Design an enzyme around this catalytic site. Structure first.
Site: not given
Ligand SMILES: O=C(COP(=O)(O)O)[C@@H](O)[C@H](O)[C@H](O)COP(=O)(O)O
Ligand code: NA
Ligand SMILES: [Zn+2]
Ligand SMILES: O=C(COP(=O)(O)O)[C@@H](O)[C@H](O)[C@H](O)COP(=O)(O)O
Ligand SMILES: O=C(COP(=O)(O)O)[C@@H](O)[C@H](O)[C@H](O)COP(=O)(O)O
Ligand SMILES: O=C(COP(=O)(O)O)[C@@H](O)[C@H](O)[C@H](O)COP(=O)(O)O
Ligand code: NA
Ligand code: NA
Ligand code: NA
Ligand SMILES: [Zn+2]
Ligand SMILES: [Zn+2]
Ligand SMILES: [Zn+2]
Ligand SMILES: [Zn+2]
Ligand SMILES: [Zn+2]
Ligand SMILES: [Zn+2]
Ligand SMILES: [Zn+2]
Lengths: 332, 332, 332, 332
Positions: A52, A94-95, A130, A198, A240-241, A260, A263
């Site tokens: 990210s 990522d984003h 994004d 997320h 996904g978490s 993805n 968490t």
């Molecule tokens: O979809 C994702 C995972 O979602 P979860 O698995 O955390 O629900 C990733 O794309 C998140 O946007 C990413 O963890 C954000 O990271 P951060 O900006 O904090 O460094």
């Molecule tokens: Na999640």
């Molecule tokens: Zn994400």
């Protein structure tokens, strides 16, 4: 090895064809990269490591706080490590919103374009644009130009329609096919929103609507003049978490090729570190005039445990997504 | 930037000439490298980052456990990071005994020799050969051949006479000058033992004898036909953690140019992680049916604190060694 | 046994005569009372258990918050326990200011007066009147009437001149002898202030002036027409925790017969509880869906350790004060 | 107040008549007694405080380790405290096997017999004889003689048939009525085993068979020539912690008047102590040369929280058992 662009395209094609997906594990460091790759290898699976904007900034250190520097440094580290594993490891960012394109994705694309101009392969194999915070037409205008640049650098573009929690409409699905085609102008991945969130909440709280993804595929199939069961989109499942196994299974049926995870792997990494500090409290702290115990305040002592625990959670992801045992290296 | 061989030689020459030294900080990861370099930069100092055989193995991950892979991966990471700091950062490998030469120092030397053959600079700027466990003549025989190879790759060799705790004799000092000269056949660093001990013990326990170093310089000066106050050796002080300020000061007077620190920076790194786990116990653990708190089990939350704390300890080392404010970039 | 009034008077007389003192340990509970008495017994020493107004309130429970109730309940508990130990245990109440006399010391005095009227002994063997916040004449006016009531109930009165940190003047020493005599109208204990401080601070911070106590004895001796080396006052040393051994020794020379300890025994009690929680973190917490471990969340598991640790600190106090091995039961 | 024998008999009669029960909370200390009574009072409920042989030993201190001493000391404490609450508090002793009768129940019975001989009330209001480890005829022979002694001292006897985990037979129920009657020779409580288990396990693990209790009542009713819905036994439910609400409800229907709770109140007591130690780690430990923080190592700081938490769990027990709001003092 690091996934070549050809191998990565084959990975995603095979996943879609066979209704499985790869984990895309957010990483922030040498230890987390090592944990993720070991997890893929232990599962006999290919996989994706992603950074990210904040992960990249963190990777660059407090003295730098530069996204490009952190992403490049961690990517170079990963290139050396991945060469020692039989499975294919793709690197992804990522984003990246509109105001960070000039300081993240564009400069990284330029680095890869230079590599490719010299007969090499790109540093990253995919980048996320994004644009979900801007209107759909602007999102897809930027996406179209980035797709051209990415494809020319042998890079897959991920885009996002709808904002993931912290739904994608039939018209937005239609506009995406119209603007970008269905892979023939360069492969792209579509992060469509379907009630995904997320973070990790109590069971029940997150209510997924995978029918949105089914509808998107049907909308695209109709637009392209394909049979009603065609899956023209390669979907990405953000957040996904914390998902139920059955929810993941349903998403796979509708063309999710990338889920993805951050968490849950964060918790897995930290959990044994917490345990180590508590059970070794009088070794990691200098207490009552004593000097602590080097063997337990040596960062490796707990970081090895963190690594191993995160790898186990990655193995679980590979089994949940049905990519375990399917690495395209077929090393078995 | 990464220290070029020319800059590193100048660093060590300036240190010796002015009776100061550089910290050589053992690192094991992206976070620890970042912490060390930020510490050097905050102190306006040049510095050395070193990887032990175990640190390199750890850096390669549990799925690889290969010293060369870990050292290369961490070095490549460091090359990207160091380019973003105004100070000079040299890369070094720590204790390599006879049975690990073929799987650590020699292959790394070969990588650097290939780089240099193509008009580039070496990956590492110094390597340690630790032959202290073999007889002095065998130690220096291996040292002589490694010095030739190292110098040809624009690399400084560190050697060790005597075993650091966990004293160097006049004859061993004499033999070293005889076998290797005094820099004219390639610069080398000498880890001479003088009561120094790896690790951190209660104040008083470690009894240093810096007069051993004074004697070594006098022995070398006499051998070379130099004035009695000459300092022909560039000494390395292993076991720097836990030393009294006055002990460090005395060692500087006798030509220590490099003081190795690991244990104290380990404590500095771990200390805020321990604190974070305790004060956030119900966030880093899923307790009483709750799901924890992502904001505090995100590894970055505590690793930023670890980094900053380790950097502060590195700044302290630069002030103890009198290299603070003396970086050869003179960025001020 | 509980100290009878006769035994308590003999205790204090013997201490003064032989230049030793007793610890007066603040207690708040069955466990802390048990720890204190076991400490006295392990040291072969007599001793004093004291309840502050807050300790008594705590002892009464959150559902009552009544000082008299808590002091009586804990005293009744202590009477049963002390009968099982060979050493003499005196019960005392700590700091009672003017606005709490009617709700602490006076009602407790009345309970003991009723016991004595029936041919029994008092519930407590001493009570503190702390009038240090009011002018000296008012302090001593209240003290004189309380001394009459206390002596009639076979109880020793403690008074305070000067405020202990969180110095007693020659005139205040003189006024005390004038108003109260030197024991012939009932024994009293004098908490004179001499730079002593409640709490535990870093070494050096607290600067004691035991010469103040020496001066007080000389002032009293002159008033009473006694030799210059006479010690007419029985002094109490408040704020004993954290004191240097040499400071305690000097205070003994000038007629301290009672040294109050709370903070150091608090630390000793809590220290193994903290350790228990950390090393058993996953047993005392229900973590990751598990149900914890009864054997380690049973309060007795850590409270036994707390008790034993506090007892050890009490033994240390008895050796510091030179009352160890001197119990008037001479059980040996 | 402490329950008089008359009030305690009325309590148990009212509970049975109205299909509710009282919690019997194991206590070990002043703090746990205070927590239990405050819980009863907060629930507007009468209740029972009980001491096991180990709880009594613990209450006597490590320097004594005498069951009678600990039980008497804690009972005397409780008598003072309970007088300050509007609800009725009965005192009970828990499991006493054959080899401990001479050193626990018998001496305690003798103390109460002496009190009653002087026109007073017993110290405890019930005692448990646990003869479940001996044959039923021997169990009931001892029970019959103890019942005579207990009734003469105005004390209720609890007995046990079957061993609680760590089922009662129709014939054993019959033998009990034959040997002891149905209250007319002195009230007794019957701990009949029905799949109940001491301790707390994961949901599902413990499988209760309350039909055993229903059968026991029917067996007794038939023996006594009573209607089939009569409940001649006053049952005790050992192992109450961790039970499902619905299981408790079913047990109430069949004449349980007393449910013993220890493990769940232990967890409730310890849980905030653990939390306190973690969040105040650098105050309860002297770390890095600092002296800690008295405000947080003062045992009252965490023991108040422990008390309040245990009281809340006791309130929950009163609501589960349907005794909340039903205290026979009717203070409302
Ligand atoms: O979809 C994702 C995972 O979602 P979860 O698995 O955390 O629900 C990733 O794309 C998140 O946007 C990413 O963890 C954000 O990271 P951060 O900006 O904090 O460094
Ligand atoms: Na999640
Ligand atoms: Zn994400
Ligand atoms: O002198 C040194 C530091 O000594 P201290 O600063 O620790 O006293 C280094 O050279 C040590 O040998 C090094 O930390 C050992 O690392 P490891 O083999 O555990 O990875
Ligand atoms: O002198 C004493 C001990 O001093 P330290 O040993 O703590 O220095 C006692 O008399 C204190 O006043 C007492 O601990 C205060 O108790 P609290 O009002 O908090 O319940
Ligand atoms: O039934 C009971 C509670 O069961 P749980 O509520 O703990 O399931 C009590 O009677 C137990 O036997 C008692 O806690 C044992 O206490 P210990 O001998 O350890 O001092
Ligand atoms: Na050291
Ligand atoms: Na003090
Ligand atoms: Na239970
Ligand atoms: Zn295959
Ligand atoms: Zn070393
Ligand atoms: Zn300069
Ligand atoms: Zn005081
Ligand atoms: Zn004696
Ligand atoms: Zn039981
Ligand atoms: Zn009522």
């Amino acid at each position: 090895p690091i996934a070549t662009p050809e191998v990565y395209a084959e990975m995603l094609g095979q996943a879609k064809q066979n209704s499985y997906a790869f984990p895309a594990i957010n990483c922030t460091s040498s230890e987390t990269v090592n944990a993720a790759i070991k997890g893929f290898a232990d599962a006999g699976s290919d996989g994706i490591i992603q950074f990210s904007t904040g992960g990249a900034e963190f990777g660059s250190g407090l003295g730098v706080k530069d996204m490009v520097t952190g992403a490049v440094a961690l990517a170079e580290f990963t290139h050396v490590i991945a060469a020692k594993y039989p499975v294919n490891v793709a690197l992804h960012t990522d984003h990246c919103p509109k105001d960070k394109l000039d300081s993240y994705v564009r400069p990284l694309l330029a680095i890869s374009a230079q590599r490719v101009s010299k007969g090499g392969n790109p540093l990253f194999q995919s980048h996320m644009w994004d644009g979900s915070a801007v209107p759909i037409d602007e999102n897809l205008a930027i996406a179209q130009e980035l797709l051209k640049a990415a494809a020319a650098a042998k890079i897959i573009l991920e885009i996002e329609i709808g904002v993931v929690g912290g739904y994608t409409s039939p018209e937005d699905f239609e506009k995406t096919i119209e603007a970008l085609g269905a892979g023939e102008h360069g492969k792209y991945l579509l992060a469509a929103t379907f009630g995904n969130v997320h973070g990790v909440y109590k069971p029940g709280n997150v209510k997924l609507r995978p029918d949105i993804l089914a509808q998107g595929q049907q909308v695209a199939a109709a637009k392209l003049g394909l049979p009603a069961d065609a899956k023209p989109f390669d979907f990405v499942f953000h957040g996904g978490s914390g998902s139920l196994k059955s929810e993941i299974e349903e998403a796979l049926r509708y063309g999710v090729v990338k889920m993805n995870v951050d968490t849950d792997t964060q918790y897995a990494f930290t959990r044994p570190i917490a345990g180590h500090m508590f059970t070794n409290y009088d070794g990691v702290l200098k207490v009552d005039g004593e000097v602590g115990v080097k063997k337990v305040y040596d960062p490796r002592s707990y970081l090895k445990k963190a690594e191993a625990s995160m790898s186990q959670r990655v193995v679980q992801a590979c089994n949940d997504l049905h990519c375990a045992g399917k690495s395209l290296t077929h090393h078995h």
